[PDB]
Design a protein around this ligand. Sequence first.
Ligand SMILES: *[C@@H]1O[C@H](CO)[C@@H](O)[C@H](O)[C@H]1NC(C)=O
Ligand SMILES: *[C@@H]1O[C@H](CO)[C@@H](O)[C@H](O)[C@H]1NC(C)=O
Ligand SMILES: *[C@@H]1O[C@H](CO)[C@@H](O)[C@H](O)[C@H]1NC(C)=O
Ligand SMILES: *[C@@H]1O[C@H](CO)[C@@H](O)[C@H](O)[C@H]1NC(C)=O
Ligand SMILES: *[C@@H]1O[C@H](CO)[C@@H](O)[C@H](O)[C@H]1NC(C)=O
Ligand SMILES: *[C@@H]1O[C@H](CO)[C@@H](O)[C@H](O)[C@H]1NC(C)=O
Ligand SMILES: [Zn+2]
Lengths: 197, 596
Amino acid sequence: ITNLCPFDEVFNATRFASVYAWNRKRISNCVADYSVLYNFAPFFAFKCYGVSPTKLNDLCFTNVYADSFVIRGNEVSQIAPGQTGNIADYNYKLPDDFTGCVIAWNSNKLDSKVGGNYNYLYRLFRKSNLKPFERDISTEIYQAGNKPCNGVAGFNCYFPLRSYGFRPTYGVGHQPYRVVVLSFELLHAPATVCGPK
Amino acid sequence: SIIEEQAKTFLDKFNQEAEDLSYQSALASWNYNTNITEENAQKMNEAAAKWSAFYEEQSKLAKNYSLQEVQNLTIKRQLQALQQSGSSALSADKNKQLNTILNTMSTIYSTGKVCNPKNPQECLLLEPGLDDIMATSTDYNERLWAWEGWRAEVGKQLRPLYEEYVVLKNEMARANNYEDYGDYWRGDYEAEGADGYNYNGNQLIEDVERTFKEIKPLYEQLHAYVRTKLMNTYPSYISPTGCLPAHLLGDMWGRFWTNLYPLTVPFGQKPNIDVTDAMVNQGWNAERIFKEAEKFFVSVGLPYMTQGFWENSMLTDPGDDRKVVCHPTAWDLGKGDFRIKMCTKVTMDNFLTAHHEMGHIQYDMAYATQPFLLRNGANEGFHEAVGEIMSLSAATPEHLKSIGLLPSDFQEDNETEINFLLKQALTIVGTLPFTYMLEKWRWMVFKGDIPKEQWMEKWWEMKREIVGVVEPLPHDETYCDPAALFHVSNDYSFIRYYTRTIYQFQFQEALCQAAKHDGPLHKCDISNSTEAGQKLLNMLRLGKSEPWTLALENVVGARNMDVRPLLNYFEPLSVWLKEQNKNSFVGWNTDWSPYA
Ligand SMILES: *[C@@H]1O[C@H](CO)[C@@H](O)[C@H](O)[C@H]1NC(C)=O
Ligand SMILES: *[C@@H]1O[C@H](CO)[C@@H](O)[C@H](O)[C@H]1NC(C)=O
Ligand SMILES: *[C@@H]1O[C@H](CO)[C@@H](O)[C@H](O)[C@H]1NC(C)=O
Ligand SMILES: *[C@@H]1O[C@H](CO)[C@@H](O)[C@H](O)[C@H]1NC(C)=O
Ligand SMILES: *[C@@H]1O[C@H](CO)[C@@H](O)[C@H](O)[C@H]1NC(C)=O
Ligand SMILES: *[C@@H]1O[C@H](CO)[C@@H](O)[C@H](O)[C@H]1NC(C)=O
Ligand SMILES: [Zn+2]
């Protein structure tokens, strides 16, 4: 037991990323201690699929991907395989055959200020949906009519990205939430991520 | 279609952008109201200003999507509310003229003084100057001069302003494809949907008349009782077979007859039920009062109160170097923020007002998931009808006996019930013909059936027939009696007070049959009943997404308004009044006048 994985700089980070620019970290060649993970907040959401929630520290995988972002309260249900909405259609998509865990908790005391936090953005308009595990960071103007937009905002020409504006006196369903998605893959290669002996 | 998708995208952007501005305006208003200071006002105004501007742009930019090309009803309902423009349909000069007329009328009403004869050195104002005289005094001439001065000093200055007010508002109404301003007000009841769920503004007149023709006999009986009781205090000024003088109805305009209870009490040796002494003895505060209402609401199967409700609400007078507006109100600031402002004292009236306001809060929480522009009550009468039934249910001498404010061996006599019903009648039944007559007169004046040269004649010819009130002194065409009322001179609708009274009782009946209640209707408690709460929440969660006919059907079982529950509520009192009026005349004539 000498190569503990760096899960502490994925849950204790000082600044998370927006939904449309979600952050991906690849974890390989370490021993994974899936028990410090329980030491954090009451974990409003600790739901996961294809894997026993109590016997993770018994099986070996070739790679673990951690994706981090911040969403709203009444959108955590959209982080699940086979769902339709706004976050799950234009921002972040999960495959139907998903093997991994979804963790989500509350961050009102950290990501909410009097006056509004306008640093968190999400996409509102897109021409087509997203294939699973895909990113779009373009800022071209959405065209909704026959008239060509020609690089200027106006009638039937919308800027595709909008903000949240969190304030401390909001309700539970409009408060900030931090979400980490862990995806385990097992490919044809030597397995290099395993639990403690 | 193609226009429908563009409308959907436009509404998505509007909904995204409007929540923030509305929330900022609401928060500024709250901070001003709970903390009165000069610089807290300016910010408020600024916030409000921005909101207006935003709306004033979108209502134009939303007129470019033809409404007939949208087929799905929710999008059409959202877009129609946005497309409606009011005073913006006129030019700048006429809008400025209308605004300067309205401000002048409001200012004249607010600062008005009636100077007493007999050493006119101390003149009285309106609010704490004449309400006391007209609600407490028992002197004929003292009431007469106060009644006449308010019409001869404030009513005669509002005639020329009103005459051109009407002309401006009719043109503003015709600028929006209407016939008159009365149609503009009656169009709030428009409903569009499937077959049999439609409703225009012309059916409201017929429904109101149909309901009043049934309500009238009970009013006649109550009128006869009050007439035969007022002859012991004004012997020579009342005819046994005539109308009632206007300045002897316990109010400045006669809107409410509550202040006649000391003179018309059936049995004066039996006091009413008051639980203030028990509340003070046991030891109660505002928090206990507001928690005993949350228990009532969660008894029937409704959600608890939000945590932010207990932290962001002012339930007591601060009692420090901070000035607050002391008037109960329930605030829905948006984004899951619900608050209540109220100066709470340990009394029974505050105990009932808490239920009334938490009814509004629970109504707001039900449709918080609906989209913007569809996040209001079904019409302008549902919101108070929900609050009033809770107050009715939380005041019976069986709910108070459960919470421990009355002895466990308390038995109710039949003498107190008659007194309670008479007090309720004097404030419910006695205000319906007044509202009907006022709104009918205003509709006729707007539409043109009443020419300008015959305004007060129609007033004191309709009041002597519909209501039964006769003027003390002659009034020619120089006065404007209706303008001496707060709602008439401040651009406010008045029929919302007529429909609500009809609605509430219906609701109560539907919530007393589901609760398996056996007995008279005025002793119904819907606590510890889950099916009643579920049936009510079936209607609470819609909002404006569906026509109000479907919302009414979801809770009552009928698609329209009827008066049978109201008459069922007041049945023991009707029997008692009929028994008590054998040797008396039921009715009135329109030929007797105090001045002639
Ligand atoms: C984050 O840091 C805190 C205290 O330093 C503690 O909960 C733990 O070390 C970290 N939490 C996780 C989930 O790694
Ligand atoms: C009331 O407003 C003043 C600003 O005029 C502010 O300083 C004060 O803190 C406010 N009261 C409270 C309780 O915050
Ligand atoms: C949108 O409406 C304005 C009027 O406010 C009009 O001038 C403009 O041409 C319209 N745009 C269209 C029809 O594309
Ligand atoms: C109309 O629009 C609403 C959007 O709120 C949608 O749910 C519904 O399926 C659409 N069609 C009908 C027939 O209501
Ligand atoms: C309602 O149920 C509670 C719980 O048993 C009971 O104490 C109470 O007496 C019942 N009735 C009323 C009117 O609260
Ligand atoms: C009340 O009940 C008593 C008991 O019989 C009866 O004598 C009396 O007439 C009743 N009074 C009313 C007003 O019902
Ligand atoms: Zn109210």
